[PDB]
Design a protein around this ligand. Structure first.
Ligand code: SF4
Ligand code: SF4
Lengths: 49, 232, 109, 32, 49, 32, 32, 232, 109, 109
């Protein structure tokens, strides 16, 4: 029970950002669902990604 | 991860893609019908599209709202089929409005069809590169003289079902007849009511104690004989 | 299948808008696809001018197919024997000669 | 035209709201 | 309990969880499409309460 | 113009939904 | 022109109804 | 009634109104930031607007939906800020997405700004006539690369809070460390996992009976030693 | 990759609308950004006129490319060898020579 | 910050709509306010006509600023040295001269 509560509070405290975007046909066919990918963005990173 | 082959994955990233073809298979064998193959498009020779050897005949069809999600209600994509000449109505009154069947959607890139679909003949042909999905028809929301709309659902959908499926006790049994739990394999003795009979066609069990007494099989009765626990 | 052998006046229009699958990306690099296999289907704007005597005949023929039957028609000088349907014909009867202004939409078999 | 478009949009919004109420009350969702 | 989520993926019912895994694919400005607004990525955060 | 029309439709689909919510919960509806 | 506007308005109304349900289900309000 | 001075109310009667100006102050001192001053517009000199001596710099800000009411839900007006050059994202990545801060909206009439905003110089200036409201940021509903939308709320709004804050426990404390009930002020003796440390930066109670016994404040324990009330 | 060497009649129109991120203040100071790297993409309106015997050839070319394939083209006198695709063209078959009106939209690779 | 010294053909158009805060009551009594401090910003419609040789130079200068950078420009005879930006321009290329038809929207610093 303590582990479950700690997981809930930690997951709710750290994962606090959600991003939506769009993708062409290749990516749509690629990712099936519930996978891990990097979304590198030069706008937020004020650099050249 | 998906089961898409490497070559189609490589091609999908190309800047100059080819046409996208969607082919549909309606299977009613689990219901008592046949297998129908539909394609929204035909080839350049005005012929049904040949894929993997079989032929998808040209016929109106359009799928919409295909969504997959883990939270909230399970998604219900829709399918539209033109009902002209009464083709859909021909099977709706026979197959109980196409309820319980299966639909299979295969998407394919145009550069992988069989060579017979092109006048010059496609050399980049591979009949094992497609993406497959399957759903089940739920209801025919609209049926008119011009069109027909079907709702699709996931086979695993758990709407209107309860987990523990036992009634515990009653005056009546709660199983099937001649299943793997009733364990009866003898000749016909009883029918829908408590009337003696000797024909296999009208073998039926009233699922009461009298039926068990008729069939000399009481030790497999699925009704606990309490009755008076609720009163006393 | 019937054929259309009536002769057409100068000023005929041909229009063509191919059906393509366009998606635009970040800095260009738009993915483009041909959509359906027979994407291109021309649309003609055809005007005739015939004396009233045979005017009825045109209507009769144009009445026979309605707007649901296709008929073969060879466009002028064009290398194709195509099949085409029309549903928007109109006529200007004035004194002696009536002019017809219809549109002919190409359709696959 | 104003009033016809307004009444049409109002009725369409009512139909949409009814459909949303019907669809969200099946097994899951937010159970309105 | 097992901190999972069910989904109809790849014509099969599967379950996913927050298990540390590896990156699958990458996305930047070139692979995504922006709407008429001007920016392709739309971010959002949680609420105080 | 676009955004004016979108805001108008959004605000029009508010009181419609509110009235639908209120009427469907009164006596013999689905209680929202 | 035609059914495109109808589909647009239908989706917009559904979204508005979802937002109304969410905002009325909250602590304050009528608890739809 | 409002705290409206007589002069501004008298001016707000005539037909020929002046220009309404709205200025915003984002206060983050209670959360760990600084005070930011914003105005939607600048003066005729192309300079930040000077009010009460301080300066508000120009930046695209727009507040919509201020609806004070006593029934139904609470008030959640929306503040839109242009996120160009990544300026908003800079503090958002640092100040935990601007959650918990305060926003103060002051509205003023044009004829009361400081004389330095006008080439001729206003002789009607009075830096004590304005209308003030305050709200708290609740969430950043959407921050793209071109804009950023914040939801506002009343400070006293109740949502997700329960009235009887007291909770009955068995072997866990209920209050904070050293705050008011744990009247402990001696040297650090324990840490998170009840290890014998003597460093102040790691001294945090384990919220147990053993922590209290270590700190000799068991007389101030919030956990009642019942436990075995449901077994019998 | 094919090219386009047919001649262009006088009066061809050029349009250009670069993409910017408008966002407005109370008054003035409206911040602006250059959006993507390739902001402006010129749009050309090209008119041609060919004798009837030649027309089919041009048609076939515009049929071969469809509305999804790019081809090199050099605007008259212009210092750039741009790549352009077309998706709208029409023609007037009058008696001897047919004139085409087409639109050409610039696209990056 | 660059300038704009190209000649302007006669017929330049000027537009001005001040932003005001209008609210009407029972019998008039309409409250009016100037809205922003500097409300009205004139927009010009300007046409030029130059030989083809420096059409490239004009196009390059207009491209440099894109649709976001502003540049100083003195309207003809007008008492002000304002700064302006443009986001739309078109040209009618002929075999001798090309004419530009652009719009110049005034912005403050
Ligand atoms: S009642 Fe006795 S016989 Fe009839 S089904 Fe149940 S078990 Fe088999
Ligand atoms: S447990 Fe004992 S020491 Fe730790 S906080 Fe509660 S009271 Fe203070």
């Amino acid at each position: 029970a303590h582990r479950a509560g700690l997981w809930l509070i930690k997951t709710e405290l750290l994962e606090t950002q959600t991003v939506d975007f769009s993708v062409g046909a290749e990516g749509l066919r690629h990712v099936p669902g519930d996978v891990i990918e990097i979304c590198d963005d030069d706008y937020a990173g004020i650099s050249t990604g | 991860m998906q089961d898409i082959r490497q070559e189609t994955l490589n091609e999908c990233t190309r800047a100059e893609q080819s046409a996208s073809v969607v082919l549909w298979e309606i299977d009613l064998t689990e219901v008592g019908g046949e297998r129908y193959f539909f394609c929204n498009e035909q080839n350049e020779k005005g012929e049904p599209v040949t894929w993997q050897g079989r032929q998808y005949q040209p016929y109106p069809i359009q799928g919409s709202g295909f969504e997959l999600n883990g939270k909230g209600t399970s998604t219900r994509p829709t399918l539209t089929v033109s009902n002209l000449y009464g083709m859909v109505t021909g099977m709706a009154e026979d197959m109980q409005s196409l309820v319980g069947g299966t639909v299979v959607r295969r998407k394919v890139y145009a550069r992988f069809l069989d060579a017979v679909n092109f006048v010059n003949g496609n050399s980049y042909a591979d009949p094992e590169q497609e993406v497959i999905s399957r759903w089940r028809i739920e209801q025919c929301s609209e049926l008119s003289a011009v069109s027909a709309s079907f709702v699709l659902s996931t086979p695993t959908e758990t709407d209107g079902a309860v987990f523990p499926g036992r009634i515990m006790l009653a005056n009546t049994c709660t199983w099937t007849y001649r299943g793997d739990e009733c364990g009866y394999s003898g000749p016909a003795v009883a029918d829908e009511y408590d009337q003696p009979t000797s024909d296999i066609t009208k073998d039926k069990c009233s699922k009461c104690l009298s039926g068990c007494k008729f069939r000399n099989n009481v030790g497999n009765f699925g009704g606990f004989l309490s009755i008076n626990k609720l009163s006393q | 299948m019937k054929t259309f052998r009536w002769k057409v006046k100068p000023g005929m229009d041909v229009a063509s808008v191919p059906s393509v699958r366009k998606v635009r990306f970040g800095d260009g690099y738009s993915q483009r696809a041909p959509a359906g296999l027979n994407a291109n289907l021309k649309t003609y704007s055809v005007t005739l001018s015939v004396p009233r005597e045979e005017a009825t005949v045109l209507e009769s023929f144009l009445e026979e197919h309605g707007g649901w039957k296709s008929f073969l028609w060879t466009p002028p000088y064009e290398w194709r024997q195509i099949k085409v349907t029309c549903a928007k014909w109109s006529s200007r009867v004035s004194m002696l000669r009536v002019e017809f202004s219809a549109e002919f939409e190409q359709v696959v078999n | 035209i104003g009033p016809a478009a307004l009444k049409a949009v109002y009725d369409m919004a009512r139909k949409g709201a009814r459909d949303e109420i019907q669809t969200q009350m099946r097994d899951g969702g937010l159970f309105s | 309990a097992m901190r999972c989520m069910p989904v109809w993926n790849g014509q099969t019912l599967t379950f996913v969880q927050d298990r540390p895994s590896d990156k699958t694919w990458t996305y930047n400005r070139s692979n995504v499409v922006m709407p008429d607004d001007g920016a392709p990525f739309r971010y959002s955060f949680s609420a105080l309460k």
